[PDB]
Design a protein around this ligand. Structure first.
Ligand SMILES: *[C@@H]1O[C@H](CO)[C@@H](O[C@@H]2O[C@H](CO)[C@@H](O[C@@H]3O[C@H](CO[C@H]4O[C@H](CO)[C@@H](O)[C@H](O)[C@@H]4O)[C@@H](O)[C@H](O[C@H]4O[C@H](CO)[C@@H](O)[C@H](O)[C@@H]4O)[C@@H]3O)[C@H](O)[C@H]2NC(C)=O)[C@H](O)[C@H]1NC(C)=O
Ligand SMILES: *[C@@H]1O[C@H](CO)[C@@H](O[C@@H]2O[C@H](CO)[C@@H](O[C@@H]3O[C@H](CO[C@H]4O[C@H](CO)[C@@H](O)[C@H](O)[C@@H]4O)[C@@H](O)[C@H](O[C@H]4O[C@H](CO)[C@@H](O)[C@H](O)[C@@H]4O)[C@@H]3O)[C@H](O)[C@H]2NC(C)=O)[C@H](O)[C@H]1NC(C)=O
Ligand SMILES: *[C@@H]1O[C@H](CO)[C@@H](O[C@@H]2O[C@H](CO)[C@@H](O[C@@H]3O[C@H](CO)[C@@H](O)[C@H](O)[C@@H]3O)[C@H](O)[C@H]2NC(C)=O)[C@H](O)[C@H]1NC(C)=O
Ligand SMILES: *[C@@H]1O[C@H](CO[C@@H]2O[C@@H](C)[C@@H](O)[C@@H](O)[C@@H]2O)[C@@H](O[C@@H]2O[C@H](CO)[C@@H](O)[C@H](O)[C@H]2NC(C)=O)[C@H](O)[C@H]1NC(C)=O
Ligand SMILES: *[C@@H]1O[C@H](CO)[C@@H](O)[C@H](O)[C@H]1NC(C)=O
Ligand SMILES: *[C@@H]1O[C@H](CO)[C@@H](O)[C@H](O)[C@H]1NC(C)=O
Ligand SMILES: CC(=O)N[C@H]1CN[C@H](CO)[C@H](O)[C@@H]1O
Ligand SMILES: CC(=O)N[C@H]1CN[C@H](CO)[C@H](O)[C@@H]1O
Lengths: 387, 400
């Protein structure tokens, strides 16, 4: 979407995966969807390095809505958002952050809150702009395909007409199977800054693998459509939650990075472990994710050993490689060379291991190397030519 | 098997899951299958609390064999076991541990090492006893169903005839589909101390779930067969390795305990984290696993919320309860009561949370309670009539 926004993938925090539709503030005040939750997360992002590392969006998901007023104007739940959304936008802005919100193209939100029907699209866009929102995720429950086909373009146009830059995240393709012929990716790129292609992530390794598999199965279609201002979105990071092991957490970060995915966390920033912070705040990893060329990577090799190799092209003749073990036994010594991974001949390279920080220098295409990859884990290199 | 052994489930360490068939000692001396590996693991078991908490077996799996000598006697790989197996058994015994070994009822071991064919069953049994081995796992690759039907009883008879008590772990049912009519559990209970019912565990939560699902699906058949001296074996613990999260690691420990499973670790004890050691060395957890009645537990409740409840009967009218969340979203507040979990009579109970150590007092059947269960995780209670506390302090003694 040609609105000047998200020339690199969005980084931030999104409520949904970890906090879901918990509205029981009487019994669970610390974890319910509420103004307090968002203010506390904003504070952590400001104070604990997140904003400084690039994590700038703080996004509200489903279950914020209270109703519509006599003029049809959307309102937040007054018990859980007592000061209203402008208050929260202003608070987040005072901390150098951006506020995202959520609506549904359809009669109701997925969890049954008031929907943004076709006849409400313009009003709702105007309300969000008036509130000084910075991003909108438009879900697609409780609509027909024809309604979504009218609605998503209508919302892009309505947001534009407000004059406020609002990043636009579109769930449209996920409701239509994610693929041609029903999904038109050139159309999506013209109307959306990012789109959810596929199924919601859940807090499990199986879920991560299911998403990775669908993305890699369809990478010939998906890889070319991503670029500055228009990203594929394989969903939220699980890092900091319950379902991923340490190796798996590091793997998701590396693989989302090579896929030029949004880095939208969804975890309790108030209690996040040092180990998990270190993954998410890895400076080179973020540099790679945020590479200005915005070229989504691909799986380039799959071996009978169950080692997979992904490659992302980067600025300044650099590349990212992710060596990914789908083995479930023990560490594996993977033997390769840059020549076996299709690199340019006669060039000499240097590599930095993104997780260890160690430097491997003087690699020619013919140079044999070994990387040790743990099960359901990765080794990631940032590689560039040297003199 | 009525050989006086494994009146409670075996606890120990088995090389296979973590170290597999790594024989490259030239490139990987610290992690290859070798006498050094076993000696270092024994030292850790003796020094770091494992033995003292009940982990007594240290078991060799596949890939130890060098060949057979001119008389047909098994030899370990001389480059990897330069001192021989008797030396290793002696070393392990000197630390108060027991040594397990591995063979295959078939032409070769699964990784292609010399097989214990029917003609070698007796000789190999005699060799193992002479080496002062304490446990034998008998795998089933490269055999026919008739060879297994002959061989597993033949090995049980051969071990018996050596006069040395050797705990006998039989893979037979895993090669027959794990179920009647092909598997005859009444025979297995008479010839084996434990048996691998089902597929090999791998270092993933999906694997743990697949095994749990199978045991729960078939628990009407499987639960009654387990007891002192004859256990079901759902395979090794994954705690300490790569695939399980913290919540999953605690779940596996709890569920294996409720199932009266062996607690056979397979992890690098030299680098295991304090957090994972704390799960595996939990004294109440181990007490429950080792309960002298040896009654395997069952899943007693499954709810549309994806919370499941398992219960294991214990000594002195105590019970273990595991509340298990198969949810994949966020912590869940599970509301229940003992009455809803088929506790009847007007007994007043107390519970200890096995992981937190917290005590919950004054539970009657009607008492509403809430437990907070994390996704792919558990809450586990040791539950007892409160009158047990008093009665346990009011026993009276006299000299004989
Ligand atoms: C509502 O919708 C409109 C229409 O889509 C948006 O207006 C567009 O905004 C974008 C982003 O600001 C503009 O794109 C930029 O144009 C710059 C100059 O282009 C001039 O020349 C072209 C022809 O060559 C004319 O069409 C145009 O009128 C301009 O006069 C470029 O310099 C920018 O380049 C950027 O990208 C390149 C590579 O991608 C980088 O090398 C640069 O560094 C730089 O980052 C960019 O292309 C676009 O021109 C606008 N179109 C129109 C018709 O006005 C509104 O932004 C939007 N409003 C809201 C609130 O959402
Ligand atoms: C080869 O195979 C034979 C079976 O064919 C095995 O022989 C059995 O060995 C076990 C273990 O040693 C024996 O079990 C023990 O019996 C002891 C004596 O009980 C006798 O007396 C009672 C009468 O009171 C009879 O009912 C009974 O049949 C016996 O004749 C018990 O004292 C032992 O108790 C153990 O367990 C209790 C807990 O339950 C503990 O408190 C005790 O401390 C103790 O550990 C035990 O039950 C069994 O009797 C033998 N059976 C037969 C038929 O002889 C061989 O062991 C096996 N050899 C090898 C090398 O594997
Ligand atoms: C989104 O909401 C609209 C408007 O509420 C839905 O349309 C309405 O749907 C109801 C029933 O769900 C319709 O009632 C039906 O009327 C016919 C008349 O013959 C009757 O035979 C049926 O038994 C039933 O009562 C109602 O007419 C209709 N109203 C309007 C104004 O269209 C729509 O179904 C919802 N869309 C989605 C995608 O969920
Ligand atoms: C287990 O082995 C026997 C014997 O196999 C022979 O010796 C081996 C070392 C190897 O070199 C084999 O190729 C030899 O055939 C197998 O029984 C034989 O089966 C073959 C059919 O493949 C048949 O021609 C012979 O008649 C059989 N020989 C005898 C002595 O019965 C047996 O099938 C193997 N079992 C399994 C489960 O693989
Ligand atoms: C790389 O390894 C291959 C196979 O292991 C070997 O044949 C070759 O000599 C090695 N190449 C170099 C340049 O050392
Ligand atoms: C337990 O909770 C239910 C509501 O969920 C209530 O109706 C019932 O009376 C409670 N029982 C007791 C003993 O407090
Ligand atoms: C594809 C898509 O937008 N899925 C969404 C489906 N609906 C929930 C909230 O109800 C989340 O927003 C989830 O991310
Ligand atoms: C059921 C069974 O014994 N499976 C075994 C299959 N064979 C390997 C060694 O090769 C392991 O021992 C594994 O535990």
């Amino acid at each position: 979407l040609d609105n000047g926004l998200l020339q690199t993938p969005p980084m931030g925090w999104l409520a949904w995966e970890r906090f879901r539709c918990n509205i029981n503030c009487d019994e669970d005040p610390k974890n319910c969807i509420s103004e307090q939750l968002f203010m506390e997360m904003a504070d952590r992002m400001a104070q604990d390095g997140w904003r400084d590392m690039g994590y700038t969006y703080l996004n509200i998901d489903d279950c914020w809505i209270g109703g519509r007023d006599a003029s049809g104007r959307l309102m937040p739940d007054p018990k859980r958002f007592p000061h209203g959304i402008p208050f929260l936008a202003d608070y987040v802005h005072s901390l150098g952050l951006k506020l995202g919100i959520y609506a549904d193209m359809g009669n109701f939100t997925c969890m049954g809150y008031p929907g943004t029907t076709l006849d409400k699209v313009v009003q709702d866009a105007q309300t969000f702009a008036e509130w000084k929102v910075d991003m909108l995720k438009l879900d697609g429950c409780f609509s027909t395909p024809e309604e979504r086909a009218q609605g998503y373009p209508k919302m892009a146009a309505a947001l534009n007409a407000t004059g406020r830059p609002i990043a636009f995240s579109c769930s449209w393709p996920a409701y239509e199977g994610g693929l041609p012929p029903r999904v038109q990716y050139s159309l999506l790129a013209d109307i959306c800054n990012l789109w959810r292609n596929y199924d919601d992530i859940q807090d499990s390794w199986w879920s991560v693998l299911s998403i990775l598999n669908w993305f890699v199965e369809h990478q010939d279609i998906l890889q070319p459509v991503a670029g500055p201002g228009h990203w594929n979105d394989p969903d939220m990071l699980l890092i900091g939650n319950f379902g991923l092991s340490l190796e798996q957490s590091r793997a998701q970060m590396a693989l989302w990075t090579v896929l030029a995915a949004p880095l939208l966390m969804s975890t309790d920033l108030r209690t996040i472990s040092a180990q998990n912070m270190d993954i998410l705040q890895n400076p080179l990893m973020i540099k790679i994710n945020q590479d200005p060329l915005g070229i989504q990577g691909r799986r380039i090799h799959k071996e009978k050993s169950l080692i997979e190799v992904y490659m992302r092209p980067l600025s300044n003749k650099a590349s990212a490689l992710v060596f990914f073990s789908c083995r479930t036994d023990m560490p594996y010594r993977y033997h390769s060379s840059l020549g076996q991974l299709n690199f340019t001949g006669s060039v000499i390279y240097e590599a930095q291991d993104v997780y260890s920080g160690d430097i491997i220098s003087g690699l020619r295409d013919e140079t044999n190397f070994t990387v040790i990859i743990n099960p359901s884990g990765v080794v990631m290199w940032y590689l560039y030519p040297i003199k």
